Design a protein around this ligand. Sequence first.
Ligand SMILES: *C(=O)C[C@@H]1O[C@@H](C)[C@@H](O)[C@@H](O)[C@@H]1O
Ligand SMILES: *C(=O)C[C@@H]1O[C@@H](C)[C@@H](O)[C@@H](O)[C@@H]1O
Ligand SMILES: *C(=O)C[C@@H]1O[C@@H](C)[C@@H](O)[C@@H](O)[C@@H]1O
Ligand SMILES: *C(=O)C[C@@H]1O[C@@H](C)[C@@H](O)[C@@H](O)[C@@H]1O
Ligand SMILES: [Ca+2]
Ligand SMILES: [Ca+2]
Ligand SMILES: [Ca+2]
Ligand SMILES: [Ca+2]
Ligand SMILES: [Ca+2]
Ligand SMILES: [Ca+2]
Ligand SMILES: [Ca+2]
Ligand SMILES: [Ca+2]
Lengths: 114, 114, 114, 114, 5, 5
Amino acid sequence: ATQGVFTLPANTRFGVTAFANSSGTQTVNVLVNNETAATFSGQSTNNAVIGTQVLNSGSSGKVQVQVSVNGRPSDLVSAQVILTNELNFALVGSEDGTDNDYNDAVVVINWPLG
Amino acid sequence: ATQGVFTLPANTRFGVTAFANSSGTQTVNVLVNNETAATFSGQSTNNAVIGTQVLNSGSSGKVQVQVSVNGRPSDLVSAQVILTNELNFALVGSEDGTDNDYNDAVVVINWPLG
Amino acid sequence: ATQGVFTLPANTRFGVTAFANSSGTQTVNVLVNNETAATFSGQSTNNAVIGTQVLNSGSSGKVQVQVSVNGRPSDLVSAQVILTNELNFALVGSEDGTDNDYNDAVVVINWPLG
Amino acid sequence: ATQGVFTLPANTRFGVTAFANSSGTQTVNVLVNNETAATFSGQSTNNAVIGTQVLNSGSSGKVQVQVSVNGRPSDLVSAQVILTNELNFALVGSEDGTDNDYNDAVVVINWPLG
Amino acid sequence: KAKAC
Amino acid sequence: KAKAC
Ligand SMILES: *C(=O)C[C@@H]1O[C@@H](C)[C@@H](O)[C@@H](O)[C@@H]1O
Ligand SMILES: *C(=O)C[C@@H]1O[C@@H](C)[C@@H](O)[C@@H](O)[C@@H]1O
Ligand SMILES: *C(=O)C[C@@H]1O[C@@H](C)[C@@H](O)[C@@H](O)[C@@H]1O
Ligand SMILES: *C(=O)C[C@@H]1O[C@@H](C)[C@@H](O)[C@@H](O)[C@@H]1O
Ligand SMILES: [Ca+2]
Ligand SMILES: [Ca+2]
Ligand SMILES: [Ca+2]
Ligand SMILES: [Ca+2]
Ligand SMILES: [Ca+2]
Ligand SMILES: [Ca+2]
Ligand SMILES: [Ca+2]
Ligand SMILES: [Ca+2]
């Protein structure tokens, strides 16, 4: 099944934050309405924040997370969780190798903001 | 029900990151085995990262997140989510007032690392 | 925070299913747009299905789960989870006593159907 | 990423329940420690419970859900959710055709019981 | 075990 | 907003 694709309400501010846990440099692309809206790059084996930003979901509300390492797309796992019918998390894990810890790039999207 | 308490696997490194979305200064305390392990303080209405740190779950694995604003405890909502039986998210929202967006302090714990 | 309340897409069929794990008789009320659409009453200490039903979310899509034992409202925990941006689970647990296992009535809502 | 595999606490009683939303007859296999512990078979397009059972997680705690239609494995999505650090849901969706509603067999594993 | 008994 | 004070 497709992973890393989330439907947000239109024109909504959301945060997006990426963490790295791999010897390979992580490239995180965030797409809104099928266009690149943010790009994060960094390397860490200690969960360093390689990027954090506020974006807008635009007229379509379609948000997609893509992760690649040295040009190779990583395998993604994802899910969305809603607390008290209000607080939204869109969660992404990714695996760039063979150990399947799926933390190599960890991306957290949250809304609403403010 | 109790919120903001999570049993992690013992002696495991985990990341803890706090976001602020409120006029009020957020005081985020992270307890490991009932002992203060980290404390974050910050204010933001644009999802600023007010703290990010790598901690160890210790021999008990018990991690508790507490949030207060101006010395008053916030109401917490929380849940844990596991993707592909490997990637763990422990999620906390908090409400410091009466609009009930529960984003005033957002805390994300993730593990494993490395 | 409010628990057991979920916003579904309007005019959408969903399933609701209740399990019991308590010496107390569980009364599960499922409200759609603030009015009772289904009611389950059963007793089990081994996860028996005390009710399952297909309902329509109606005009505004507000769905609320209430649980009571001998007229006393139980304490609820809840969350919603979305997989591959399409499959929805709205989850409810409830505690009617003092052991805080929160399984005394477990309610699972799932959509879409068909 | 692998889907439908969950590590439960060892020697723990849990419930497993399958719902069907498809014209195809769904075959759900529940493996404990890589050995078939329960098998459900049924057909429904109205979310009918095609099987429910109480199992024991055994010494390994490994539980795997498999779904197939006419010998063809369905595409699985899954996640585990823990509420108030006590109530566990292991959730599986499955797609047996082409419309990607991933509800054709829905499987809910919950614990603790009693 | 008190909720009924 | 009153938290600001
Ligand atoms: C090495 O290239 C593989 C890689 O980096 C490791 C340090 C570890 O984080 C592993 O999960 C990752 O796939
Ligand atoms: C047909 O065999 C496909 C199948 O059954 C439909 C009634 C619908 O539930 C569809 O999602 C499912 O894949
Ligand atoms: C006793 O009435 C309390 C009650 O029933 C027990 C068998 C157990 O399920 C407990 O969790 C529940 O609150
Ligand atoms: C007022 O201080 C209350 C407070 O701050 C607002 C800007 C908004 O974030 C609200 O959710 C928060 O409780
Ligand atoms: Ca890896
Ligand atoms: Ca890694
Ligand atoms: Ca607030
Ligand atoms: Ca706020
Ligand atoms: Ca109980
Ligand atoms: Ca119980
Ligand atoms: Ca289908
Ligand atoms: Ca279907």
